[PDB]
Paper text:
To determine the structural impact of this mutation, we crystallized a construct composed of 40 residues from the N-HR sequence (N40) and 37 residues from the C-HR sequence (C37) and solved its structure. Although the mutant six-helix bundle crystallized in a hexagonal space group (P31), three-fold crystallographic symmetry did not run through the center of the N-HR coiled coil as it does in almost all previous gp41 TOH structures. Instead, the structure was markedly asymmetric in that only two of the three N40 segments were folded into α-helices throughout their entire length. As a consequence of the asymmetric distortion of the N-HR coiled coil, the three Arg552 residues occupied distinctly different chemical environments. One Arg552 side chain extended from an intact N-HR helix into the coiled-coil interior, where it formed a hydrogen bond with the backbone of the other intact N-HR helix. Thus, in contrast to the wild type N-HR coiled coil, the Q552R-mutant coiled coil possessed dissimilar C37 binding sites, with the distorted N-HR segment substantially disrupting two out of the three sites.
Entry of human immunodeficiency virus type 1 (HIV-1) into target cells involves fusion of viral and cellular membranes, a process mediated by the viral surface protein Env (gp160). In the Golgi apparatus, each protomer is cleaved into two subunits that remain noncovalently associated: an N-terminal surface protein (denoted SU or gp120) and a C-terminal transmembrane protein (denoted TM or gp41).
Residue numbers in the entry:
A (entry chain B): 543 to 581, 624 to 663
B (entry chain C): 544 to 582, 626 to 663
C (entry chain A): 542 to 581, 623 to 661
Write the structure that this text describes.
């Protein structure tokens, strides 16, 4: 019931943290590329597409985490 | 009828949400730099960074306080 | 009995992962600002930045992996 739903919620939040870690690593890559130029456009197109896909996945996982949060709260009410 | 562990507010998911706002701000910042390197609004970006950074650290601190209360309730039997 | 314990134990590692990812975020913000002040010695400082990224990335992957291990234990307990 409630503990089951909590465990299922943790799975989605953990996937979101993992996907956000990937997004972080992509931002680290972009910062490093620009720093090496200070001190191609196809590669940046690939960077943009990886950002888009992981951002889209994260928003999906957040939304499903939000949906499970409401199910859990309604599960707790009334019991 | 239940333990407070299973009812407390999910500030962890709130932190995940706010960290995604920060990530998307850093993506925007990187994209602007990229457009000039390869060839005001930045105060607004700085402000938004600071606001979400302040929010996230508040959620982390509250999540840590919940964690301490969760552990103590486990110990209370 | 043990499921509630495992749920609490996982929350600790997931919160630690979120904290470590926040420090990674702050490091990327630092790098973005350094490049922005340039547009609109330092080699050692950037190596120090690179070293902090690596240390926090390694910590995050460790906390994620152990959060996943506890997720599996929790799911198996439910089964």
């Amino acid at each position: 019931q409630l503990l089951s739903g909590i465990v299922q919620q943790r799975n989605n939040m953990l996937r979101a943290i993992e996907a956000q870690q990937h997004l972080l690593q992509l931002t680290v890559w972009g910062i490093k590329q620009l720093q090496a130029r200070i001190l191609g456009h196809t590669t940046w197109m690939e960077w943009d597409r990886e950002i888009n896909n992981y951002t889209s996945l994260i928003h999906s996982l957040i939304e499903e985490s939000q949906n499970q949060q409401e199910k859990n709260e309604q599960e707790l009410l009334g019991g």
